[PDB]
Write an enzyme that holds these catalytic residues in place. Sequence first.
Site, short mmCIF file in Angstrom:
data_model
loop_
_atom_site.label_atom_id
_atom_site.label_comp_id
_atom_site.label_asym_id
_atom_site.label_seq_id
_atom_site.Cartn_x
_atom_site.Cartn_y
_atom_site.Cartn_z
N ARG B 150 0.86 -1.22 0.00
CA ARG B 150 0.00 0.00 0.00
C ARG B 150 0.89 1.26 0.00
O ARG B 150 0.81 2.01 -0.90
CB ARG B 150 -0.88 0.00 1.23
CG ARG B 150 -2.29 -0.35 0.88
CD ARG B 150 -2.55 -1.74 0.68
NE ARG B 150 -3.87 -2.03 0.23
CZ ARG B 150 -4.24 -3.25 -0.22
NH1 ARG B 150 -3.37 -4.21 -0.28
NH2 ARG B 150 -5.46 -3.46 -0.68
N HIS B 355 -13.55 -25.96 -19.65
CA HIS B 355 -13.81 -24.49 -19.72
C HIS B 355 -13.40 -23.93 -21.08
O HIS B 355 -14.18 -23.23 -21.71
CB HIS B 355 -13.12 -23.79 -18.55
CG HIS B 355 -13.20 -22.31 -18.57
ND1 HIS B 355 -14.01 -21.59 -17.73
CD2 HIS B 355 -12.56 -21.39 -19.31
CE1 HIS B 355 -13.88 -20.30 -17.98
NE2 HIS B 355 -13.00 -20.14 -18.93
N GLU B 356 -12.18 -24.25 -21.50
CA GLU B 356 -11.67 -23.74 -22.80
C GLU B 356 -12.47 -24.34 -23.96
O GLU B 356 -12.70 -23.62 -24.94
CB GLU B 356 -10.18 -24.04 -22.93
CG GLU B 356 -9.33 -23.24 -21.97
CD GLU B 356 -9.60 -21.75 -21.97
OE1 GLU B 356 -9.77 -21.17 -23.08
OE2 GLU B 356 -9.64 -21.17 -20.89
N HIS B 359 -15.59 -22.44 -24.19
CA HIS B 359 -15.23 -21.15 -24.83
C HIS B 359 -15.22 -21.30 -26.35
O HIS B 359 -15.90 -20.54 -27.05
CB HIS B 359 -13.88 -20.64 -24.32
CG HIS B 359 -13.99 -19.62 -23.24
ND1 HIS B 359 -14.48 -18.38 -23.47
CD2 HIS B 359 -13.65 -19.64 -21.93
CE1 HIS B 359 -14.45 -17.67 -22.35
NE2 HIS B 359 -13.95 -18.43 -21.39
N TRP B 458 -13.48 5.31 0.60
CA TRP B 458 -13.04 3.93 0.28
C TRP B 458 -13.16 3.09 1.51
O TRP B 458 -13.82 2.05 1.48
CB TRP B 458 -11.62 3.92 -0.26
CG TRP B 458 -11.03 2.56 -0.41
CD1 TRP B 458 -10.13 2.02 0.42
CD2 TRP B 458 -11.27 1.57 -1.40
NE1 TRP B 458 -9.81 0.77 0.04
CE2 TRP B 458 -10.47 0.46 -1.08
CE3 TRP B 458 -12.06 1.48 -2.53
CZ2 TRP B 458 -10.44 -0.69 -1.86
CZ3 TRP B 458 -12.04 0.34 -3.33
CH2 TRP B 458 -11.22 -0.74 -2.98
N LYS B 462 -15.77 0.17 2.60
CA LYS B 462 -15.20 -1.15 2.86
C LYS B 462 -15.64 -1.63 4.21
O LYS B 462 -15.91 -2.80 4.34
CB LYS B 462 -13.67 -1.10 2.75
CG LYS B 462 -13.07 -2.39 2.25
CD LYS B 462 -11.99 -2.21 1.30
CE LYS B 462 -11.66 -3.36 0.42
NZ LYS B 462 -11.84 -4.65 1.07
N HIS B 486 -6.74 -4.34 -12.01
CA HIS B 486 -7.82 -3.84 -12.89
C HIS B 486 -7.97 -2.34 -12.77
O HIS B 486 -8.57 -1.82 -13.69
CB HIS B 486 -9.11 -4.55 -12.56
CG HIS B 486 -9.07 -6.00 -12.91
ND1 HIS B 486 -8.50 -6.96 -12.11
CD2 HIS B 486 -9.59 -6.65 -13.95
CE1 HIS B 486 -8.62 -8.11 -12.71
NE2 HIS B 486 -9.29 -7.96 -13.81
N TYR B 496 -17.44 -9.23 -13.51
CA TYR B 496 -17.33 -10.33 -12.52
C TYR B 496 -18.58 -10.48 -11.65
O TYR B 496 -18.72 -11.51 -11.01
CB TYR B 496 -16.09 -10.15 -11.64
CG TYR B 496 -14.83 -10.08 -12.45
CD1 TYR B 496 -14.33 -11.21 -13.08
CD2 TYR B 496 -14.18 -8.88 -12.64
CE1 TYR B 496 -13.19 -11.14 -13.86
CE2 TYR B 496 -13.05 -8.79 -13.42
CZ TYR B 496 -12.55 -9.93 -14.03
OH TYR B 496 -11.41 -9.88 -14.79
#
EC number: 3.4.17.23
Lengths: 72, 719, 134, 67
Positions: B150, B355-356, B359, B458, B462, B486, B496
């Site tokens: 941080r 999974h692939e 896809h 923030w 939180k 991200h 998500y």
Amino acid sequence: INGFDLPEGNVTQENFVDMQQRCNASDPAAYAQLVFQTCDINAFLSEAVEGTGLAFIVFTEAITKMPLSPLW
Amino acid sequence: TIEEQAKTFLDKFNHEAEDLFYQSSLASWNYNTNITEENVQNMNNAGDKWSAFLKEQSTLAQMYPLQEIQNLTVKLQLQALQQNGSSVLSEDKSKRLNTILNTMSTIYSTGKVCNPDNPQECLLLEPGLNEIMANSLDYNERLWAWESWRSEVGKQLRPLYEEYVVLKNEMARANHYEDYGDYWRGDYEVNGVDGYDYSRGQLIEDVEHTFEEIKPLYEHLHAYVRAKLMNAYPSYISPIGCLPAHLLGDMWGRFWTNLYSLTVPFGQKPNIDVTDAMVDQAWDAQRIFKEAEKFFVSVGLPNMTQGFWENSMLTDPGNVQKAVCHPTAWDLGKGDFRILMCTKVTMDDFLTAHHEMGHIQYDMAYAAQPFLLRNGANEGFHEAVGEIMSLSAATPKHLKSIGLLSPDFQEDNETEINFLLKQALTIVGTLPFTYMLEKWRWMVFKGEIPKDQWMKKWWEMKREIVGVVEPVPHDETYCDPASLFHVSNDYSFIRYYTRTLYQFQFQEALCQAAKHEGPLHKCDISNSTEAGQKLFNMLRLGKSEPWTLALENVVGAKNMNVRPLLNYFEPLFTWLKDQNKNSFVGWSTDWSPYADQSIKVRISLKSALGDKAYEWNDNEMYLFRSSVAYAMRQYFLKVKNQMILFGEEDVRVANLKPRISFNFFVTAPKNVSDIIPRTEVEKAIRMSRSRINDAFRLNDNSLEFLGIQPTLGPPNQPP
Amino acid sequence: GWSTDWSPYADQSIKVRISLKSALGDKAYEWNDNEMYLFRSSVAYAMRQYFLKVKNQMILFGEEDVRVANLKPRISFNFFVTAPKNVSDIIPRTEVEKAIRMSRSRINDAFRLNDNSLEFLGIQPTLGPPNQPP
Amino acid sequence: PDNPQECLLLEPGLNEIMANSLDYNERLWAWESWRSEVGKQLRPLYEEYVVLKNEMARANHYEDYGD
Ligand SMILES: *[C@@H]1O[C@H](CO)[C@@H](O[C@@H]2O[C@H](CO)[C@@H](O)[C@H](O)[C@H]2NC(C)=O)[C@H](O)[C@H]1NC(C)=O
Ligand SMILES: *[C@@H]1O[C@H](CO)[C@@H](O[C@@H]2O[C@H](CO)[C@@H](O)[C@H](O)[C@H]2NC(C)=O)[C@H](O)[C@H]1NC(C)=O
Ligand SMILES: *[C@@H]1O[C@H](CO)[C@@H](O[C@@H]2O[C@H](CO)[C@@H](O)[C@H](O)[C@H]2NC(C)=O)[C@H](O)[C@H]1NC(C)=O
Ligand SMILES: *[C@@H]1O[C@H](CO)[C@@H](O[C@@H]2O[C@H](CO)[C@@H](O)[C@H](O)[C@H]2NC(C)=O)[C@H](O)[C@H]1NC(C)=O
Ligand SMILES: *[C@@H]1O[C@H](CO)[C@@H](O[C@@H]2O[C@H](CO)[C@@H](O)[C@H](O)[C@H]2NC(C)=O)[C@H](O)[C@H]1NC(C)=O
Ligand SMILES: *[C@@H]1O[C@H](CO)[C@@H](O[C@@H]2O[C@H](CO)[C@@H](O)[C@H](O)[C@H]2NC(C)=O)[C@H](O)[C@H]1NC(C)=O
């Protein structure tokens, strides 16, 4: 001011009631914890006593809150 | 026509884009399957040819009308190409934004921290810090890693984030949007269909509504985890308080998946593990994919293209040839389809293969659509299809049906509860985090949060939404949200949330159409071509029609719903409600890990000085922190006979108010885990209070420490 | 030849003389490295305030930017100031004189000193208003 | 100080600046910074080292370690 960390000088003898209401609205629980005292000049005025009390309990204490105190 | 000329250009552009796109994908395919500086430029020049082509064709699309177009088929493709993009920014401004993005990505990638005692070895986040945040059970090591990352990276990343938000907001405003948050939410927008419309604002409300149905189950999960963490760290967690942020199994608390070793409901017996059984069967990559292909085709879906089986990257090259083993799916087009992922012999490899394959099957199911129309309905369907495929392929009856897991074996509920809680710690532990981070970013772009209250809001959100409390107070010098991948790298995060809800909606709908009788989490899909057909219906739709329509084509519902997810965990929800019968379900947003050693300070400038009283700014806070550090230095030198170099960085302040009131505590010079107990800080303040008072022109009544009262006033005037 | 008194930083230094025994007489505190820490923090506070209230810039000076030399039992020494993350940037004396003039009432009160006891050689106090009979 | 991600070691980076840099600011930064980091780390070890080496030399029929 202590109960709601208000900026000093914002609450005054005039806007005290409105600020009290606003603070209660903001946090009733915290305000509930706050204890206030009834401010009535008539009460202190009615504290007038007769006999030695008027001088030894009322005049002696008023004199200590006066400049050139001993002289008076 | 105008519509005719538009489709004319689009059809020509489709041919012009598909061929060059294939070349770019082939080039990127080669480079990703061949780490050679030589092919690095090869794919680059191709990607550059792909990018310049992009810009020029959009300029071409500019003259083409938009509202005038009626055929939504063509309208969608034009709207996708009509995006002026960041180019709306001034050249100098465009260069400035590009360098800001590069600087933030580089600071995240190459930033490093190191030990206070041996500063020669420094740890980067990817390997060193991440490993500590996952494996370590030591409170001090985890607190050091969390706070140090941080401090270094967020304090470097804050001003770049300020300039980034300003420039991105300017570009979004100049691009006929409200803010940058509006630009991000524009992905979900659907209009001009007269009955399936979806406004950009409406999405916010929907998300909020969904979270109202998660709070209950999640609060129970939080309560259960808190009790277990209390055992893992006694005397550190309050049973009625939030969870400290550095004990959540990784750096940020995105996932609680690493608490399973400490939160296992029934540690007595392990979960299903056939990696050994797979090795005994000597099943290989080709097999895992072939058995996978069997399951996918077992429901009337097309068989995997032979092309893939010929030009794929299933096994580690390991022949003087090095390729990223990260699982992926390449859709070069014109029947060229591939999947690249290194194949070990594990369960997770089996599930990743499924999974692939999901896809690539989704990607190849709609090759007939135009080049601009060859994508998922939105940013959640593509991963949702893979997730439901992997979830359906992991059922114990599936393992019984593939030859292993002999039929003379009964599966009890205890292992089932173990599996349900392991799934919950990944799926349900991230929804509050995702919601809160996207909410904070939306309100920061919206201008709701001023630039001097980013960290305040923030940590307030939180503590309130996620039930996670910071172990050390953070001021606005910090940029904790920018410490995620991200956030620094400019990526949207609401995918998500919607993906997680869509996967469960799809799973419930398909598994109901498969004519089940038992619980949702134990149900399968194989031999249910009806379920496959319903999924395929949306699969082939791609982005040709609205996402709200595509979702209804499978779940029969226009919008997203939390109910299917809640049903997927009804079993664990019941168990958790039983386990938390004594435990306080919920959390309080006043307890802090440092709040039991803090000292409160109240300052009255207008009383002591009256007129000609100075203003109180951050320089007065700097002086106050230096005075407290002086006091602590003097106390330790003159009593304990030790010389300790306390600084103004060791005096930590929280909860600043206009009353000039606040809390503080002290730590050891180069050890954030060492907190000086209040008693020592009270003794130090008692020793140096006259100097601390006369530094500020206050005298023991306008500067009060709420616990320390003067006592030495003995008069001897009249003897 | 060469002279062993010239220093690269000696042009922009300020000298300080402190007399504890004159100001306080009895019950005067001892002067240790913690008092030097407080003095460096006070000078950093002064420089921060000057740069915020005049030049309209916010600069985070610390006690590591205040460089001290020639400490004597007289309680004399020389100091200069540098930019936070730049050892090559030295704030010229004139700015440091102006900052000390602005914050001298506070720096003196932080050391129970009275301008006479705390002397910044080259900086003369000029605030003595005399008036009794109007 | 502007970029904390690129860090120089004495042999490869600091020596090259000290050997060629004609920039007064770059040379002052390299000189001071090396002094600050490495000398502040190396001081207490040097104190313990001199004490132990003096003890060993004295216990070996020598006056001091310099002897
Ligand atoms: C919008 O334009 C597309 C492209 O011309 C139309 O798609 C055509 O639909 C007809 C009828 O099904 C087919 O015979 C054509 O082969 C399709 N063309 C392509 C390139 O796919 C679509 O029908 C148009 N939509 C409307 C409402 O007119
Ligand atoms: C991106 O650039 C294009 C091309 O200059 C802009 O297209 C113009 O849009 C306006 C408003 O609709 C029209 O009046 C012009 O005639 C268009 N020009 C062309 C060449 O078609 C587009 O508006 C730009 N986007 C933004 C948001 O700046
Ligand atoms: C889907 O149906 C097929 C056909 O009935 C199942 O394949 C059989 O599976 C059983 C159990 O493993 C074997 O004993 C049979 O020999 C298989 N025969 C055939 C024709 O495939 C398949 O297992 C079913 N799906 C699942 C996952 O159970
Ligand atoms: C699986 O089911 C059994 C049977 O219902 C559960 O055993 C019960 O456990 C509770 C709690 O200890 C007892 O009060 C009951 O008397 C038990 N019932 C029997 C018949 O023994 C068991 O707890 C369940 N396991 C899970 C994972 O929930
Ligand atoms: C920083 O301070 C903490 C707290 O004093 C230290 O943690 C203690 O470490 C010792 C030595 O390992 C243990 O005996 C204590 O039980 C620990 N207690 C607590 C409260 O953590 C920590 O080791 C210190 N770190 C460094 C680098 O000195
Ligand atoms: C640190 O301060 C020094 C001294 O002011 C700077 O060196 C000067 O920088 C300016 C601006 O680049 C040049 O015009 C001068 O010729 C430089 N010479 C001097 C006066 O030493 C240095 O650039 C500053 N750098 C940092 C990292 O802040």
